[PDB]
C-alpha cells in the first residue's frame, strides 16, 4: 500500500519500497514501518512497487505511515521527467534575485530547488 | 512566513523544463487582493 | 623457578582484562540490531546476516586476547 | 572440595547419561504426546 | 492415562548417540587418570 | 432431528469429559496425535485461534 | 553454617505463599475458564444448527 | 549409596509426578498444576518453531523440552539448603554440552557434506580475508562448544557458594557483640535476596540453554 | 611461597575483566526497552533476539571468570 | 605465611574493581525504562517485568565478582 | 606483621574504586528522570517512583564495595 | 616503616575514585540544560529533582574521599 | 636473569590489555551499519565496502597491540 496524492493528481493513491527525502535525511519505507509523521523536504523521489520504479520530483509535503500500513504521502505537485536545462537558466537569474530582495527566503528556496535540480 | 509558504514557492519553482501544460501554469498564477478589514474599517485591497 | 611460574599466574590475570572490550562490543552490535529492527520491522531479514557477520568479528578481538592468556597459562 | 573438584567423574557420568536417556524417551513417547492430545481434544470439540 | 505414541528417534538422534559413546569412553579414561590423584 | 436434539440434551458431559471417551468415539484423536508425532510437526494448527498461545516470548 | 541457609529458605517459601501462589491461582483459574467457555460455546452452537 | 546417584533418581521421580499427579485421567478443562506445563509446552513449541523452524523442528521439540526440564528441576533441587547438586557437578553439564556440540558438528558434517567448511565462510567478503574468516570462525565455533555449558554451571555453582560464604559470615555476625546483633535481620534479608536471585538466573539460564542450542541447531541442520 | 601468592594475586587481576560484561548485558536490555517502546509491536520478534544477544554478551564475561577460577584452583 | 595472607588481601581488593560495571549496568536499564515509559505513556505494564529481568542479570555479573572477592578476602 | 598490616591498608584502598561505578550510575538514573520529565511532562508521577527504585539498586552495588573496604579496615 | 609508606599510598589510591563523581555530576547538570532548553517551562519542577540527584551523585565521591582521609590519618 | 625472563612474559600480559580498544571499535562500525540500513533500506551497496574498509583499519590497530605482545611473549 501507499497513497501518493496531490491536489490535482493521485499518483499512487502493492507498493513495496518508497524512497523519500525528508527532514530526517533520506528515508525508505518498506512493508511494515513504525508509524510516523515527517514533513518531506523538497525532493527527488523514487517509488518502487516490486522492482519497478517510478521517479517523481516532488515539492515536499508530509509523509505519514499510518498504523494500518497506509503510507500517506501528500505533496503539492510532482514525474521527474516533466520537471527535467532552461530551468537551470531561469534559476540562475533567481540566484541573482536573492541579492536584491520574504523575497530573500523565496529566492533562497529557489537556490535550494536549483541544487535539487542539479541532483536530477 | 510559513512552512507551507516555503513549499508553495517550491511548487511554483517546480512548474519551471519547458514540457509544461496550461493547467500547471494556471496553478501557479492567480490574481487576488487581500483586503485586510478592521473593526467597518479596512486597510486597502493589497494584492495577494 | 618460583619467579617464572609465579609470573605466568600473575600475567594470565593481566591478560584477562583485555577480553572485557570485546564483551562491551558484542552488546553494542546487538543493541543496534534491536533498535534497527524496531525502526523498520521488515529490515530484519536483510540485516540479520549482516548482524551475524558483525557479531563474529567483534567477538574475534576478544578471542585473540583469550589466546594470549592461554599462551601464558600453559606455556 | 567435594562440590568443587571430586575425582568420581566416570561414576557420575554413568548415572548422568542414564538419567538423560530415561527422561528423553519418557517425555517424548509418553508425557509430551499426552499434552498434544489435550490440545487436539479441545480443538476437536471446538471444531464440533 | 500414560500411553506410548512412538516417536522416531533412531533416525533422528544417531549423531548425538555416536558422540555420546565417544565422549563416554574418553571421559572413562579421563576419570581413571584423575582418580589417581 | 427430534432424536438428535434429545441425544445432545441427554448426553452432554460438558462439565468434564475424559479424552479417552473421545478416543472411544473417534480414533481420529489418537490418529491425529500419532500423525503429528510421525510427521515431526507437533504444532496443532488453529489451536491458537480458539485457545490460548500461552507464550512468554 | 547451613542452618542460616535454612532460615532464609523458610523465608523464601513464606514470600512464595504470599505473592506467587495467589497470582498462579488466578492464572490457572483464568485458563480453565477460557477452555470451558470455548467448549460450552461450541456445544451451544451445534444445538442452534439442529433447530435450523 | 552415592549422593549424586540418589539425586539423579530424585530428578526422575519429580518429573514422573509432574505428568501423572497433576491431573486425573485427563480432564479436558485442565487442572491448575498442569496449566503451567501447558504454557511451557507452548512457548517452547512456538519458540523452536521460531528457531530451527524446519519440518524437523518438532522432531527436536521433545529434545529441547527435556533439555529445559532437566536444568529446570536440577536448579530447584540444588536450591534446597542441605542438598548436593547434579548440575553444580560441572562435569556432567559441561560434558553434556560437549556431547550436544559434537552431535551438532557431526550433524553439520552429515547435512552439509565436506562443504561444511563453507559454514566458516560467514558471508561474501573480500577474498584476501576469506581464509582469515575461516580461522576466526572455527575458533568461535568451538568457543561455542564450552560457553553453553559453562555459563549455566558457573551461575549455579557461584550462586550457592556466595550464599554459603555469606551464611558463614552471618553466623559469626550473630555470634559477636550485641551492637552487631542489632540489625541482625538485615544480613538474613540480604542472603534471602541473593537466594531469590539465584532462582531467577537458573530459570533464565535454562531458556538461554534452549535458545542457544537452538541457534546452534539452526546452524547444524540448515547451512547457517 | 612465591608461586602460591601469585595465584591469589593473579586471580584478583582477572576479575577486572568482568566489569565490561556487566555494562554489556545492560546495553542489550536498554536496547530491548528502547525497541519495544519505539514500535510497541516489535516485542515478539525482538524478545528472542534480545535473549540471544544477552547470552553472547554474558559469554565473554564468563571466559574472564573462568580464567579467574583456573588461577584460583590451579 | 605473611606473604600468602597479604596476597589474599591484595587479590580481593583488585576483585572489587570488577563490580563497578554492573553498578552502571543497573542504572542503564532503569534509564531505558524511564525513557521508554515517557515515550509511550503505556508500554510500562509489559516492560516493567522485562526491566526487572534485565536488572537481575546485570546485578548477577556483579555478584560473581563479589563472591570471588569474598573467596580471596575470607579464604 | 608489617607486610600483612600494609596489605590491609592497600587492599582497602583498591576496594574504594568499585564505588565510582555506582556514583555514575546514580547520575544516569537522575539524568533519565530529568529527560523523561522534560519529554512528557505528565509521566512524572509514575516515573519518579521508578527513578527512586533504580537509584536504590545502583547504590546497593556501591555499598557492597564500600563495606568490603571497611572489613579490610 | 613499610606500614607508614602503605598509609600514604592507600590515601593516593583512594583519590582515584573521585574522577568518576566529576563526570557524574556533569551528567546531571547536562540533562538539566538539555531538558530545560527543549521545554523551557519544565525547569521549575525539574530543578528540585536536579538538586536531589546532584547531591546523591556527589555523595559517592564523598565516600571515596572519606576513605582517603581515613587511610591517610589512620 | 630469572627476573628478566619473567619480565618478558609479564610484558606480554600487559600488552594484551591493548586489544580491548579495537574490540569496542569493531562494534561501533557495525552498529553504525545497522542503524544506517534501517534509515534507507537500501544504502548497503555503497556503505558495505566502506564498512569493510573501516573494519580492517580498526582491526589493524588491534593487531599492532598483538604483535608487540608476541614479540615480548615468544621473543
Q: The domain containing residue J59 runs over which residues?
A: 2-75
The residue count of chain A comes to 120
**Which chain K residue is nearest to residue J45, measuring alpha carbons?**
K46
Interface of E with H (CB under 8 A): 1-2, 7-8, 12-13, 15-20, 22-23, 27
Query: Phi/psi zone of residue H26: left (φ > 0), alpha (ψ -120 to 50 degrees), beta?
Result: left
Q: Which three cell numbers mark B1?
A: 512566513
What kind of experiment solved this structure?
cryo-EM
Contact H221, E12 (CB under 8 A): no
Domains for chain A: give ranges and CATH numbers. 1-84 (2.60.15.10), 87-119 (no CATH)
User: How far does F43 lie from chain E, in Å, by closest CA?
Assistant: 15
Q: Are strands A71-75 and A3-5 parallel, antiparallel or unpaired?
A: parallel
Contact A60, B5 (CB under 8 A): no
Which residues of H fall within a CB distance of 8 Å from G31?
A: 30, 35, 38
> Nearest Cα to H90, choosing from I69, C73, I52, I51?
I69
Which residues of F fall within a CB distance of 8 Å from H41?
A: 54
CA distance M40 to A48: 13
Could C49 and H140 be called an inter-chain contact, meaning their C-beta atoms sit closer than 8 Å? no
CATH number of the domain to which K41 belongs = 1.20.20.10
User: How far does F52 lie from chain G, in Å, by closest CA?
Assistant: 8
**Which chain B residue is nearest to residue A56, measuring alpha carbons?**
B14
Give the C-alpha distances (Å, rounded to integers) separating A37 from A33, A67, A72, B27, J22. Answer: 12, 11, 9, 27, 38
Which residues of A fall within a CB distance of 8 Å from C40?
A: 28-30, 32-34
Hey, how many other C-beta atoms are within 10 angstroms of the C-beta on H42? 23
**Residue given cell 584423575 in the structure block:** E34
User: Which residues numbered 1-48 in B keep a CB inside 8 Å of some CB on A?
Assistant: 1, 3, 5-11, 13-20, 23-24, 27
Q: Which chains touch K (3 or more CB pairs under 8 A)?
A: J, L
Contact C35, I31 (CB under 8 A): yes
Give how far the C-alpha of residue H14 lies from the chain's centroid of Cα atoms, to the nearest Å: 18
Q: Which chains touch I (3 or more CB pairs under 8 A)?
A: C, F, H, J
CB environment A37-69: b (16+ within 10 A), e (fewer): ebebbbbbbbbbeeeeebbbbbbbbbbbbeeee
User: Which residues numbered 42-61 in J keep a CB inside 8 Å of some CB on I?
Assistant: 43, 46-47, 50-51, 53-54, 57-58, 61
**Which chain F residue is nearest to residue D33, measuring alpha carbons?**
F33
Determine contact: F44 vs chain G, CB below 8 A.
no
Verify C-G touch: 3 or more CB pairs within 8 A: no
Could I33 and J51 be called an inter-chain contact, meaning their C-beta atoms sit closer than 8 Å? yes
| Count of structural domains within chain C | 1
Q: Which three cell numbers mark H9?
A: 533418581
Which residues of C fall within a CB distance of 8 Å from H123?
A: 49-50, 52-53
**Which chain A residue is nearest to residue C46, measuring alpha carbons?**
A30
First-to-final CA distance of chain L: 14
Q: HEC profile for chain H?
A: CCHHHHHHHHHHHHHHHCCCECECCCCCCCCCCHHHHHHHHHHHHHHHCCCCCCCCCHHHHHHHHHHHHHHHHHCCCCCCCCCCCCCCCHHHHHHHHHHHHHHHHHHHHHHCCCHHHHHHCCCCCCHHHCCHHHHHHHHHHCCHHHHHHHHHHHHHHHHHHHHHHHHHHHHHHCCCCHHHHCCCHHHHHHHHHHHHHHHHHHHHHHHHHHHHHHHHHHHHHCCC
Determine contact: F25 vs chain H, CB below 8 A.
no
CA distance I44 to F52: 15
SS3 at position K9:
helix
- DSSP code per residue over A1-18: --EEE-SS--TT----EE
Q: Which chains touch C (3 or more CB pairs under 8 A)?
A: A, H, I, M
Could D45 and G46 be called an inter-chain contact, meaning their C-beta atoms sit closer than 8 Å? no
**Minimal Cβ distance to F47: which of D32, D33, D39:** D39
Q: Which three cell numbers mark B47?
A: 494584492
Q: Which chains touch M (3 or more CB pairs under 8 A)?
A: A, C, H
Verify L-M touch: 3 or more CB pairs within 8 A: no
Contacts of L2 (CB under 8 A, 6+ apart): K2, K3, K6
Contact C61, M22 (CB under 8 A): yes
Which residues of C fall within a CB distance of 8 Å from I35?
A: 34-35, 37-38
**Which chain A residue is nearest to residue M43, measuring alpha carbons?**
A28
* F48 secondary structure, DSSP code: T
User: Which residues numbered 10-39 in I keep a CB inside 8 Å of some CB on C?
Assistant: 10-14, 16-21, 23-28, 30-32, 34-36, 38-39
Amino acid at each position: 500500500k501507499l497513497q501518493f496524492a496531490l491536489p490535482h493528481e493521485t499518483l499512487y493513491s502493492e507498493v513495496t519500497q518508497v524512497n523519500l527525502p525528508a527532514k530526517s535525511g533520506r528515508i525508505g519505507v518498506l512493508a511494515n514501518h513504525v508509524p510516523t509523521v515527517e514533513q518531506l523536504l523538497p525532493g527527488v523521489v523514487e517509488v518502487m512497487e516490486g522492482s519497478n520504479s517510478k521517479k517523481f520530483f516532488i515539492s515536499g509535503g508530509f509523509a505519514t505511515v499510518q498504523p494500518d500500513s497506509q503510507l500517506c504521502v501528500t505533496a503539492i505537485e510532482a514525474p521527474l521527467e516533466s520537471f527535467s536545462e532552461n530551468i537551470k537558466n531561469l534559476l540562475a537569474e533567481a540566484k541573482k534575485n536573492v541579492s536584491s530582495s520574504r523575497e530573500a527566503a523565496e529566492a533562497a528556496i529557489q537556490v535550494e530547488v536549483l541544487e535539487n535540480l542539479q541532483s536530477v | 512566513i510559513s512552512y507551507a509558504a516555503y513549499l508553495n514557492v517550491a511548487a511554483q519553482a517546480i512548474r519551471s523544463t519547458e514540457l509544461q501544460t496550461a493547467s500547471v501554469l494556471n496553478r501557479s498564477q492567480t490574481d487576488a487582493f487581500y483586503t485586510q478589514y478592521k473593526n467597518a474599517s479596512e486597510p486597502t485591497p493589497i494584492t495577494k | 623457578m618460583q619467579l617464572v611460574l609465579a609470573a605466568k599466574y600473575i600475567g594470565a590475570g593481566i591478560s584477562t582484562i583485555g577480553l572485557l572490550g570485546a564483551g562491551i562490543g558484542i552488546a553494542i552490535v546487538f543493541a543496534a540490531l534491536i533498535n534497527g529492527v524496531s525502526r523498520n520491522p521488515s529490515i530484519k531479514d536483510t540485516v540479520f546476516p549482516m548482524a551475524i557477520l558483525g557479531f563474529a568479528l567483534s567477538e574475534a578481538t576478544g578471542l585473540f586476547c583469550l589466546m594470549v592468556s592461554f599462551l601464558l597459562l600453559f606455556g | 572440595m567435594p562440590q568443587l573438584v571430586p575425582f568420581y567423574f566416570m561414576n557420575q557420568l554413568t548415572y548422568g547419561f542414564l538419567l538423560m536417556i530415561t527422561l528423553l524417551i519418557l517425555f517424548s513417547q509418553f508425557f509430551l504426546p499426552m499434552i498434544l492430545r489435550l490440545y487436539v481434544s479441545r480443538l476437536f470439540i471446538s471444531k464440533l | 492415562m500414560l500411553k506410548r505414541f512412538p516417536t522416531p528417534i533412531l533416525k533422528v538422534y544417531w549423531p548425538f548417540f555416536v558422540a555420546g559413546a565417544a565422549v563416554y569412553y574418553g571421559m572413562s579414561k579421563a576419570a581413571d587418570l584423575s582418580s589417581n590423584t | 432431528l427430534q432424536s438428535t436434539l434429545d441425544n445432545i440434551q441427554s448426553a452432554r458431559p460438558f462439565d468434564e469429559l475424559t479424552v479417552d471417551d473421545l478416543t472411544k468415539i473417534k480414533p481420529e484423536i489418537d490418529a491425529k496425535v500419532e500423525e503429528m508425532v510421525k510427521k515431526g510437526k507437533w504444532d496443532v494448527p488453529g489451536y491458537k485461534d480458539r485457545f490460548g498461545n500461552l507464550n512468554v516470548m | 553454617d547451613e542452618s542460616i541457609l535454612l532460615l532464609t529458605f523458610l523465608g523464601f517459601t513464606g514470600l512464595v505463599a504470599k505473592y506467587l501462589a495467589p497470582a498462579y491461582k488466578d492464572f490457572a483459574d483464568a485458563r480453565m475458564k477460557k477452555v470451558s467457555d470455548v467448549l460450552n460455546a461450541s456445544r451451544n452452537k451445534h444445538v442452534e444448527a439442529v433447530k435450523d | 549409596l552415592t549422593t549424586f546417584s540418589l539425586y539423579t533418581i530424585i530428578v526422575l521421580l519429580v518429573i514422573t509426578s509432574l505428568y501423572t499427579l497433576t491431573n486425573n485421567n485427563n480432564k479436558i478443562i485442565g487442572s491448575r498444576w498442569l496449566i503451567s506445563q501447558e504454557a511451557i509446552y507452548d512457548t517452547i513449541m512456538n519458540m523452536t518453531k521460531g528457531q530451527i523452524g524446519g519440518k524437523n523442528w518438532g522432531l527436536y521439540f521433545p529434545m529441547i523440552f527435556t533439555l529445559f526440564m532437566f536444568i529446570f528441576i536440577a536448579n530447584l533441587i540444588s536450591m534446597i539448603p542441605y542438598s548436593f547438586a547434579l548440575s553444580a557437578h560441572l562435569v556432567f553439564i559441561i560434558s553434556l554440552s560437549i556431547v550436544i556440540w559434537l552431535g551438532n558438528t557431526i550433524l553439520g558434517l552429515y547435512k552439509h557434506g565436506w562443504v561444511f567448511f563453507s559454514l566458516f565462510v560467514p558471508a561474501g567478503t573480500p577474498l584476501p580475508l576469506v581464509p582469515l574468516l575461516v580461522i576466526i570462525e572455527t575458533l568461535s565455533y568451538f568457543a561455542r562448544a564450552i560457553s553453553l555449558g559453562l555459563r549455566l554451571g558457573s551461575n549455579i555453582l557461584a550462586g550457592h557458594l556466595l550464599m554459603v560464604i555469606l551464611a558463614g559470615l552471618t553466623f559469626n555476625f550473630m555470634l559477636i557483640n550485641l551492637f552487631t546483633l542489632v540489625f541482625g535481620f538485615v544480613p538474613l534479608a540480604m542472603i534471602l535476596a541473593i537466594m531469590m536471585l539465584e532462582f531467577a538466573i537458573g530459570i533464565i539460564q535454562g531458556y538461554v540453554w534452549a535458545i542457544l542450542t537452538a541457534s546452534y541447531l539452526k546452524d547444524a541442520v540448515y547451512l547457517h
